Amino acid sequence: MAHVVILGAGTGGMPAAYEMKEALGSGHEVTLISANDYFQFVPSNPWVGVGWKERDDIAFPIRHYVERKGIHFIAQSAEQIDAEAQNITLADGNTVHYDYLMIATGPKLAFENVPGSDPHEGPVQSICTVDAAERAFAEYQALLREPGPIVIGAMAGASCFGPAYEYAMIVASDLKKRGMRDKIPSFTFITSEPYIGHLGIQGVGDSKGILTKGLKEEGIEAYTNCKVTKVEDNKMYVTQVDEKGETIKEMVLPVKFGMMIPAFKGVPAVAGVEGLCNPGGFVLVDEHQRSKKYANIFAAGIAIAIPPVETTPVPTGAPKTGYMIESMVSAAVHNIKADLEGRKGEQTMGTWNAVCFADMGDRGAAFIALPQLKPRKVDVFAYGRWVHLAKVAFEKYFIRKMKMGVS
Numbered sequence: 001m002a003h004v005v006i007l008g009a010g011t012g013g014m015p016a017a018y019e020m021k022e023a024l025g026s027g028h029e030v031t032l033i034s035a036n037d038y039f040q041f042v043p044s045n046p047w048v049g050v051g052w053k054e055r056d057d058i059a060f061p062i063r064h065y066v067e068r069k070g071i072h073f074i075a076q077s078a079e080q081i082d083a084e085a086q087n088i089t090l091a092d093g094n095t096v097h098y099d100y101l102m103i104a105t106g107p108k109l110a111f112e113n114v115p116g117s118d119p120h121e122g123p124v125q126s127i128c129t130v131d132a133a134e135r136a137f138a139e140y141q142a143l144l145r146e147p148g149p150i151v152i153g154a155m156a157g158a159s160c161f162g163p164a165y166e167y168a169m170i171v172a173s174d175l176k177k178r179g180m181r182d183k184i185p186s187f188t189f190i191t192s193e194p195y196i197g198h199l200g201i202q203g204v205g206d207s208k209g210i211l212t213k214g215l216k217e218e219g220i221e222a223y224t225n226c227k228v229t230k231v232e233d234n235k236m237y238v239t240q241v242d243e244k245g246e247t248i249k250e251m252v253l254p255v256k257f258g259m260m261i262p263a264f265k266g267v268p269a270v271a272g273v274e275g276l277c278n279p280g281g282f283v284l285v286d287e288h289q290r291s292k293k294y295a296n297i298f299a300a301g302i303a304i305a306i307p308p309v310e311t312t313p314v315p316t317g318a319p320k321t322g323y324m325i326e327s328m329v330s331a332a333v334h335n336i337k338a339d340l341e342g343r344k345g346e347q348t349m350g351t352w353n354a355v356c357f358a359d360m361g362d363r364g365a366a367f368i369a370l371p372q373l374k375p376r377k378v379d380v381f382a383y384g385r386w387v388h389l390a391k392v393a394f395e396k397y398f399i400r401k402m403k404m405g406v407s
Ligand SMILES: Cc1cc2nc3c(=O)[nH]c(=O)nc-3n(C[C@H](O)[C@H](O)[C@H](O)COP(=O)(O)OP(=O)(O)OC[C@H]3O[C@@H](n4cnc5c(N)ncnc54)[C@H](O)[C@@H]3O)c2cc1C
Pocket: 007, 008, 009, 010, 011, 012, 013, 033, 034, 035, 036, 042, 043, 044, 045, 046, 076, 077, 078, 079, 104, 105, 106, 107, 127, 128, 160, 163, 267, 269, 300, 301, 302, 303, 320, 321, 322, 323, 325, 355, 356, 357, 358
């Protein structure tokens, strides 16, 4: 008999647990450990961040749902991982042994990369978590009562650009739907992208033209090839570069309300394991989702490392999105079950791809790109009411599955 532990109940983690339990059966122990006691649908966070959805709409208590499925659940953060002894030290000092480990910890939001940028230290906020986006909203209403400049975008080293655009548009939108838009001194978009709608994938479809035009229609000035050196005194210090990295200018932007997509790092407990991860803190796995340094550690999701295909003037990364994360999960599950049965698992993540959906209210934007390098086999960007319909349906679907189980 084996004890399988899945760390982190997020987009890859909640499913991995349901699946793992399915694949193994009453024969083995499955344990899901996560920092928070509830699950959250991430894609819905920008909407919380502007106040279109409540927390209670996009999150729920994990415990009951997984335990009714034979899965043990610990609402506790992993502080330490000993890959040698194969023990996990919890927040509360308790420890947990495993036979096989599956890491699904998602990202560390590397605020520290830009001093002052932490949502608790200043006006630059975050919509990556429900707590943070609830925070953003608060500050947004502070802006409402007392209008000042707005800065939205993505930090240097970011890899998740879509939600920035989405957030900019929906904020723009929401102001008008309050008429308060013309009360705004300036509305600025700042991004590490070498051009608008690069999205960390060298553009998909006509993302350059459509996003460029959108920001213009909304009276949002856009700068590219930017990094924020520091936030300070409610001011955003910004350096802009050329294709070689030399400086073409430096800005000081007053911020009254802002949101910048931070760079993702591996979380501490995972990055801390010696030999496990790259300098970013991302787990170095093989095509079977198995660590190259520990045979009984697998990884899926944002937590895993993926080599860069392009090097941009200001550091940027490629996003790791839903569909590909599911492939990662299921492969790892199969390869682990195979490990408790003699075989080596042959299953893989599949072809690299990115799929993203943004809802602006009545209609939405979406893209599909695969594989990672152009020319691609699929390169599509779409806008339309039907995208909105799909996001709503997919959110409803995914949340139900996370209560009923998967297989
Ligand atoms: C705002 C935004 C919008 C996005 N929208 C889309 C989109 O539209 N479509 C799509 O395909 N992708 C979307 N994504 C990208 C991606 O799919 C999500 O970020 C997704 O949640 C990634 O899943 P994950 O399992 O890898 O990480 P997460 O969902 O964040 O899960 C990681 C889990 O591990 C936990 N954890 C971390 N450290 C510890 C620890 N020490 N101990 C215990 N638990 C720990 C966390 O609490 C969390 O529960 C979006 C990303 C962002 C942030």
